[PDB]
């Protein structure tokens, strides 16, 4: 959450989308990736 590689952080967002993990985690992982200027790595339209 606080410290983690983009590969793992993104792997969480990616994994969560596949398993249908809680929206809070999906949004949480996306909220970090979003603030990290890595919203392009995700399947989002920035």
Curated annotation (Swiss-Prot):
GO molecular function, one term: protein kinase inhibitor activity
Entry annotated with the keyword Phosphoprotein: no
The keyword ATP-binding belongs to this UniProt entry's keyword annotation: no
InterPro entries listed in its UniProt record: Sda (IPR015064), Sda_sf (IPR036916)
Entry keywords, A to Z: Protein kinase inhibitor, Sporulation
A Pfam family of this chain: Sda
Site residues (Important for interaction with KinA), renumbered to this chain: 19, 21, 25
Outcome, altering residue 28 to A: Partial loss of ability to inhibit KinA autophosphorylation
Domain of life of the native organism: Bacteria
An individual GO BP term: sporulation resulting in formation of a cellular spore
Function: Mediates a developmental checkpoint inhibiting initiation of sporulation (by preventing phosphorylation of spo0A) in response to defects in the replication initiation machinery. Inhibits autophosphorylation of the histidine protein kinase KinA, forming a molecular barricade that prevents productive interaction between the ATP-binding site in the catalytic domain and the phosphorylatable His in the phosphotransfer domain of KinA. Probably also inhibits the activity of KinB, but has relatively little effect on KinC.
Complexes and interactors: Forms a stable heterotetramer with KinA (comprising two molecules of each protein), by binding to the KinA dimerization/phosphotransfer domain.
Protein name: Sporulation inhibitor sda
Name of the encoding gene: sda
């Amino acid at each position: 959450m606080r410290k983690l590689s983009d590969e793992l952080l993104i792997e969480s967002y990616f994994k969560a989308t596949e398993m249908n993990l809680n929206r809070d985690f999906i949004e949480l992982i996306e909220n970090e990736i979003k603030r990290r200027s890595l919203g392009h790595i995700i399947s989002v339209s920035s």
